Amino acid sequence: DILQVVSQGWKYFKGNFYYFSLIPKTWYSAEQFCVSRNSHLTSVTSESEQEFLYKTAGGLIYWIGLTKAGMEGDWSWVDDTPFNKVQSARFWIPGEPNNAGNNEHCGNIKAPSLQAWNDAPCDKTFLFICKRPYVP
């Protein structure tokens, strides 16, 4: 139900529902909140989605579903979308990911630009964005 979901504070964009939180959490506690609402921290897989997210974020920092996984620590999406390193290079802040302090294994939307993402420590608290597909 689109009207029911939206009226609980979600936004509908191109077939997906998005929740922009108002309380900050660590990355995994954010993901746990998303899981409790049949969702995950958002993936980003097109310029139009990145644009919707950074514009709605409005210059505030939000965890998204970016996290390192595997033995090599390659970036991944918690909703299990395969990570496209080539397509995603345009979406990082220049100089990121930089693994500052050798402990930045999660990702957020930080800058209000198409170049928006930064890697930050997973145990830091930020606002966060859940994403849930609409299934009619």
Ligand X SMILES: CC(=O)NCCc1ccc(O[C@H]2O[C@H](CO)[C@@H](O)[C@H](O)[C@@H]2O)cc1
Chain contacts with ligand X (rule: CB under 6 A): 96, 98, 100, 104, 118-120
Output the smallest distance, CB 39 to Ca ion, in A.
25
Nearer to ligand X, 16 or 88 (CB): 88
Sole binder of Cl ion in the list 7, 15, 22, 58 (CB under 5 A): 22
State the DSSP string of 6-40. Answer: HHTTEEEETTEEEEE-SS-B-HHHHHHHHHHTT-E
In contact, 109 and 117? CB cutoff 8 Å: yes
**Rounded CA separation 7/13 (Å):** 14
Query: What binding mask, one character per residue, do residues 72-111 give for Ca ion by CB under 5 A, x or -?
Result: ------------------------x-x-x---x-------
Q: Pick from 26, 28, 109, 106: which is nearest to 67 by CA? A: 106
Output the smallest distance, CB 120 to Ca ion, in A.
6
Output the smallest distance, CB 79 to ligand X, in A.
23
**Rounded CA separation 120/117 (Å):** 10
Q: Which residues bind Ca ion (CB under 5 A)?
A: 96, 98, 100, 104, 118-119
